[PDB]
Design a protein around this ligand. Structure first.
Ligand SMILES: CC(C)CCC[C@@H](C)[C@H]1CC[C@H]2[C@@H]3CC=C4C[C@@H](O)CC[C@]4(C)[C@H]3CC[C@]12C
Ligand SMILES: [Mg+2]
Ligand SMILES: [Rb+]
Ligand SMILES: [Rb+]
Ligand SMILES: [Rb+]
Lengths: 286, 27, 998
């Protein structure tokens, strides 16, 4: 019940060795880890991954930072739609035409959905590869000239939808066969469709009014942008956007809506509530 | 991936077995 | 009924009596008549006041309690609170953003189970069902014989009262404690007390101060071998002398084994880290403020990662092996914990009679033809005969066999001559066997020479004789054969047969015969004289009516054939296998209720008193100087009498032990054996005790480990022991003390290998707090190490041969050199443990960058990563991962951390194999440990490729390149350890050894 002593000499009285010869160790060890983790990094090419199957059938993100995949506010409380507005403000501010400047580093491209511009090989040969851009102006009544917060939906909201950026992923849209939104403007060759529903093809309580926006007035994405070439060979790169304003005659009710995306390079998981699709609960409790 | 799952189930099963043959080596 | 140090300390002083009273000093004192007993009315009426005769056994804590008192075994608090915090937590998640997740709720039930299961394992350990009194109470009898008013009446032994008149007859058992008033020809098996089974005589002859020695006290438990007696009952049941023991024994805390007080020590250390960490990283958990349930979910981790799970029962199993292993050498183990015990042992105390020896009186020597012969005192007849070449033998055989009332019991030709049931006594049968064995039958040799008359042994004349019709074809007809005391069988001899030819009993031989009677009996042997006469042919013709009232035939100038001598001899192994326990550095001590003259002789015989070693007395008579004149420290050995123990003090005693090497406590109380054990114990030492006799119980049950004998011993001795030498081979104490020094080493190896893999289990959860990184190794993932892969490989060291003559090193030392210690933790934790993690992380770092997230873009993710809504998170390229998208890579990160761990454990399982020998010095002959490998490994695979382990365990299939990660690291671990051992073996006192040799 005493570490000490005298008749002893304490626990060691050195200690010096018992501990000094532990920095040595832990360091000689540390280093050996550092090395093997540096040569480990010789590596996995600076530009692409080494494996990509773990990001395939990419999913549909959004621009309302979902509290719980949902948006509950009143037209009243000018504080009730803050969480949604400041964060939209977050992502769209990277888009102001004041930042998109000159044939470098970007380059204007077809106001109509174009072909698949394969910038080049993933070599370092070309520097900052060039980047077909996109103006906030393809946003139906979801843009204007305001102060420090755009004039967004006091009555009948607005939620823009996005795609999951993958390194070198080329979308291949559906042929004219058996989809969901029948050929009544089915941009066959150069666009990825997005169809919104309540709860499958079975009797959903459709309590909404579906209205879309986009590039050329198309509800989907333009193959004029892919492949994406890495945030190394392509910082400043910006991705496509596709707002869908909700001006449903309904309100004060939670109704689940799913925004699937279609295509041959588009899939779904049943436990991945966002793999190649959406899922959002919506209620504007006035 | 299908070709990997049927890949590990083998050199594994030939190890519960070689183990039984090293085990029953006198008990 | 006071404290224990009283109710049980008074049961330790020897008793005191009233055999010294006169017959009228009784009468009054009990009120009992005597010509004719008690009233029957003042009988049952003494019953009420004094209360039924017989003993009542201690109560039994059932198979509830005996179990659950387990469900708190050290690691079992930690393992318990982990599954409580689990049942907390989950609840919390059944209140916030819908998480009907199977997750934690399972960890609650899971963990809880393990805590239970873990207990059994360590319960089928601390077992001890000790039915002792349901052995003593079996030595009182059904009925007893008492007289009242005058009627004699048997009755239920429990209706005997402190006062009435009991008549013990022949063969049956002694009801209470008797003071003998009338008495007849009454001998009595005092074995339960003395330890020897030779009958003593009961008379009302008060003879002696000490109530254990007077021939006028009869004893509870003992039986009347022959004769009859009458007695007044002075003690009734619980209150008697043997009963006052069955009490003192069935009253003894088994107490910590020497092993289980190792477990209850590393546990104290572990648990230590298992909190210090666990709360260091928790106030600091929420000092940077993860949620609430982001810390109580992180305890549940840090706990589990700390409590070794698959160990405290890995160890239970290591035991149960080497246990069930000795049971094949015919040594049975009744108490698992004990399989260790024998090894840690530094002192043995052995009952002589029946344990050390065979408890079979038996012929040790002879005096044919002026030469001393020796015979085979073994049980099997290893050694040599002695002769028969000479006629003199044909003659001495004749006497010894012819003049003898011993038969064999019916139906026994089966067993070996020696182990056959006689119907005689001490000498007579000891002689019967000597002959039958090495001189043809005797059922026969006693119809050849038919006996015509005989004179049985009478105390007055100390001789015994028969006249027989010698049937020769010539043929003196009438052979007189007699034996008896020797010195007093020459005063009846005038001639000494030699090689065949009579001669004069001159002075040469008379001196040399007394010259051999000394030598011979100086070996503590009963020595007998044998002589015969061919009765003059004329003087007695064919018909002569020999008479045995009026003597009638000669009794002098008889011929003197030779001396024969018996003893209670060691068993075969005993001597060779006692000096064994000293190459081992164990102290042996004789503890026997026999007499000092035999004791010291048998002592020197087996080897507890070594050549050229002396005692005080031994000395005085080697310098004709009074004893109290000898410098007692000149004396290495010594014999101590139970009658000086009586008046000694623990301290004079601690001195008698502290200062002598070869000790022999002779003629000793039952209490007294304990009184000695207790004082060997007094100073640290772990003590074993060997026995066979109900007279032993107490030591055989205070023993650190108590060994009984299988077939000799008594329901009791054994039912109060830990080991039970089923074949009575007293060498299985050497075998056992080795097999138990090895289970020690092979329990350090078995533990180390478990504990080593604990480090690359804590550090993940530890950095999860440091570099807000994505959790590399998951909880449910950890209960796959020590419960899955690691079990078998650990179990496997227990099968590991030695690394030197262990039974050539002093016995370990309970206080110093513990099972688990500084120099070991410094290794499984401080060293090989780290290296295991550097390799375990290294691949998590590879799984993620080969998948995008180049290391550094990890130093934060968690906060966001773990978010089930932030489906849009940048990697190191731009790629945006959802939830289940990235987790399916987190779990993919568990899955092969869980491997680089199994992969490193190869290198581990192979250097937790030896602690001094290079693996090329000891090799890999462990055809089981290897199996552990193949299993371990393949298990993992299966745990990773079966359609299911993913949806069940967060275990996802791996990619070839994936497995070989830890490899350089296994191989480092390997090469580091090998170079340690070298150093040591090159500098054995040097710094390295002090620091790595467990
Ligand atoms: C790497 C981080 C996360 C872990 C921090 C724990 C380190 C500092 C601890 C863990 C194990 C410890 C060692 C454990 C046992 C030995 C042996 C003894 O003779 C002196 C203390 C000594 C030498 C300790 C020194 C400090 C030590 C190395
Ligand atoms: Mg005995
Ligand atoms: Rb553990
Ligand atoms: Rb015991
Ligand atoms: Rb472990």
């Amino acid at each position: 019940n005493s570490e000490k002593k005298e008749f002893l000499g304490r626990t060691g009285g050195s200690w010096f060795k018992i501990l000094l010869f532990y920095v040595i160790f832990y360091g000689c060890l540390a280093g050996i880890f550092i090395g093997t983790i540096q040569v480990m990094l010789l590596t996995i090419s600076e530009f692409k991954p080494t494996y990509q199957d773990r990001v395939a059938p990419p999913g549909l993100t959004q621009i309302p930072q979902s509290q719980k995949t949902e948006i509950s506010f009143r037209p009243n409380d000018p504080q009730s739609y803050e969480s949604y507005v400041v964060s939209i403000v977050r992502f769209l501010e990277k888009y102001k035409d004041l930042a998109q400047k000159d044939d470098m580093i970007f380059e204007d491209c077809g106001n109509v959905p174009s072909e698949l511009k394969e910038r080049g090989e993933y070599n370092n040969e070309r520097g900052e590869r060039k980047v077909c851009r996109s103006r906030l102006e393809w946003l139906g009544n979801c843009s204007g000239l305001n102060d420090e917060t755009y004039g967004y939906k006091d009555g009948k909201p607005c939620v823009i939808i996005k795609l999951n950026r993958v390194l070198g992923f080329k979308p291949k849209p559906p042929k004219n066969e058996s989809l969901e939104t029948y050929p009544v403007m089915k941009y066959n060759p150069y666009v990825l469709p997005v169809h919104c529903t309540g709860k499958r093809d079975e009797d959903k309580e459709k309590v909404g009014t579906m209205e879309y926006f986009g590039l050329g007035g198309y509800p989907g994405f333009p193959l004029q942008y892919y492949p994406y070439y890495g945030k190394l060979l392509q910082p400043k790169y910006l991705q496509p956007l596709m707002a869908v304003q909700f001006t449903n005659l309904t309100m004060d009710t939670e109704i689940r809506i799913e925004c699937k995306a279609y295509g041959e390079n588009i899939g779904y998981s049943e436990k991945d509530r966002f793999q190649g699709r959406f899922d959002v609960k919506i209620e504007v409790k006035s | 991936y299908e070709t990997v799952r049927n890949g590990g189930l083998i050199f594994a099963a030939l190890a519960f077995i070689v183990g039984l043959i090293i085990l029953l080596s006198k008990r | 009924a006071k404290k224990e140090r009283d109710m049980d300390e008074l049961k330790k002083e020897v008793s005191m009596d009233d055999h010294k009273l006169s017959l009228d000093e009784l009468h009054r004192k009990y009120g009992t008549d005597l010509s004719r007993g008690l009233t029957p009315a003042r009988a049952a009426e003494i019953l009420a006041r004094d209360g039924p005769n017989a003993l009542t056994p201690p109560p039994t804590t059932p198979e509830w309690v005996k179990f659950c008192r387990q469900l708190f075994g050290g690691f079992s608090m930690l393992l318990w609170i982990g599954a409580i915090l689990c049942f907390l937590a989950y609840g919390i998640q059944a209140a916030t953003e819908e998480e009907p997740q199977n997750d934690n709720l399972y960890l609650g039930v899971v963990l809880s189970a393990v805590v239970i299961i873990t207990g059994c394992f360590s319960y089928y350990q601390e077992a001890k069902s000790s039915k002792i009194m349901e052995s003593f109470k079996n030595m009182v009898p059904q009925q007893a014989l008492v007289i009242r008013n005058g009627e004699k009446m048997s009755i239920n032994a429990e209706e005997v009262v402190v006062g009435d008149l009991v008549e013990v007859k022949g063969g049956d058992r002694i009801p209470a404690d008797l003071r003998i008033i009338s008495a007849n020809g009454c001998k009595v098996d005092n074995s339960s007390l003395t330890g020897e089974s030779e009958p003593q005589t009961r008379s009302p002859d008060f003879t002696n101060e000490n109530p254990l020695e007077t021939r006028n006290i009869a004893f509870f438990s003992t039986n009347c071998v022959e004769g009859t007696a009458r007695g007044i009952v002075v003690y009734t049941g619980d209150r008697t002398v043997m009963g006052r023991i069955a009490t003192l024994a069935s009253g003894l805390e088994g107490g910590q084994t020497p092993i289980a007080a190792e477990i209850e020590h590393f546990i104290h250390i572990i648990t230590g880290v298992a909190v210090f960490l666990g709360v260091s990283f928790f106030i600091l958990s929420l000092i940077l403020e993860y949620t609430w349930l982001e810390a109580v979910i992180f305890l549940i981790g840090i706990i589990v990662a700390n409590v070794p799970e698959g160990l405290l029962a890995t160890v239970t199993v290591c035991l149960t092996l080497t246990a069930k292993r000795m049971a094949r050498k015919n040594c049975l183990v009744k108490n698992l914990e004990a399989v260790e015990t024998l090894g840690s042992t530094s002192t043995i105390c052995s009952d002589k009679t029946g344990t050390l020896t065979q408890n079979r009186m038996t012929v040790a020597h002879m005096w044919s033809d002026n030469q001393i012969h020796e015979a085979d005192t073994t049980e099997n007849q290893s050694g040599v005969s002695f002769d028969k070449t000479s006629a003199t033998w044909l003659a001495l055989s004749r006497i010894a066999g012819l003049c003898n009332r011993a038969v064999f019991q019916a139906n026994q030709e089966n067993l070996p001559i020696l182990k056959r049931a006689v119907a005689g006594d001490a000498s007579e049968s000891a002689l019967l066997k000597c002959i039958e064995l090495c001189c043809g039958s005797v059922k026969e040799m006693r119809e050849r020479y038919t006996k015509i008359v005989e004179i049985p042994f009478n105390s007055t004349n100390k001789y015994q004789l028969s006249i027989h019709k010698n049937p020769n074809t010539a043929e003196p007809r009438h052979l007189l054969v007699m034996k008896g005391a020797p010195e007093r069988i020459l005063d009846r001899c005038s001639s000494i047969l030699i090689h065949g030819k009579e001669q004069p009993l001159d002075e040469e031989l008379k001196d040399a015969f007394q010259n051999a009677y000394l030598e011979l009996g100086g070996l503590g042997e009963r020595v007998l004289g044998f002589c015969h006469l061919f009765l003059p042919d004329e003087q007695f013709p064919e018909g002569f009516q020999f008479d045995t009232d009026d003597v009638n035939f000669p009794l002098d100038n008889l011929c003197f054939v030779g001396l024969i001598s018996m003893i209670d001899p060691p068993r075969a192994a005993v001597p060779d296998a006692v000096g064994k326990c000293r190459s081992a550095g164990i102290k042996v001590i004789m503890v026997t209720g026999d007499h000092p003259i035999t004791a010291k002789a048998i002592a020197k015989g087996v080897g507890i008193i070594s050549e050229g070693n002396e005692t005080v007395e031994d000395i005085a008579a080697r310098l004709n100087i009074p004893v109290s004149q000898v410098n007692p420290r000149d004396a290495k050995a010594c014999v101590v009498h139970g009658s000086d123990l009586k008046d000694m003090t623990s301290e004079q005693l601690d001195d008698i032990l502290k200062y002598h090497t070869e000790i022999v406590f002779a003629r000793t109380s039952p209490q007294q054996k304990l009184i000695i054990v207790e004082g060997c114990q007094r100073q640290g030492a772990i003590v074993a005790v060997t026995g066979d006799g109900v007279n032993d119980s107490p030591a055989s049950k205070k023993a650190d480990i108590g060994v009984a004998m299988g077939i000799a011993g008594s329901d009791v001795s054994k039912q109060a022991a830990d080991m039970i030498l089923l074949d009575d081979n007293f060498a299985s104490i050497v075998t056992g003390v080795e097999e138990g020094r090895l289970i020690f080493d092979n329990l350090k190896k078995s533990i180390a290998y478990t504990l080593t893999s604990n480090i690359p289990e804590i550090t993940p959860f530890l950095i999860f707090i440091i570099a807000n990184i994505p959790l590399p190794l998951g909880t449910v993932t950890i209960l796959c190490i020590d419960l899955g892969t690691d079990m078998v490989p650990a179990i496997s060291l227990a099968y590991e041969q030695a690394e030197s003559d262990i039974m050539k090193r002093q016995p370990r030392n309970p206080k110093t050199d513990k099972l688990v210690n500084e120099q070991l933790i410094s290794m499984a934790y401080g060293q090989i443990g780290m290296i295991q993690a550097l390799g375990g992380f290294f691949t998590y770092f590879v799984i993620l960058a080969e998948n995008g997230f180049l290391p550094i873009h990890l130093l934060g993710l968690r906060v966001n990563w773990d978010d089930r809504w932030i489906n849009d998170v940048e990697d190191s390229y731009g790629q945006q991962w959802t939830y289940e998208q990235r987790k399916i890579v987190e779990f993919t990160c568990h899955t092969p951390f869980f491997v680089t761990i199994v992969v490193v454990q190869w290198a581990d399982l192979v250097i937790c194999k030896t602690r001094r020998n290079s693996v090329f010095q000891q090799g890999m002959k462990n055809k089981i440990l290897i199996f552990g490998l193949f299993e371990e490994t393949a298990l993992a695979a299966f745990l990773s490729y079966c359609p299911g382990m993913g949806v069940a365990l967060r275990m996802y299939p791996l990619k070839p390149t994936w497995w070989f990660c830890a490899f350089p690291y296994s191989l480092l671990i390997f090469v580091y350890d090998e170079v340690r051992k070298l150093i040591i073996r090159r500098r054995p006192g040097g710094w390295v050894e002090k620091e790595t040799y467990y």
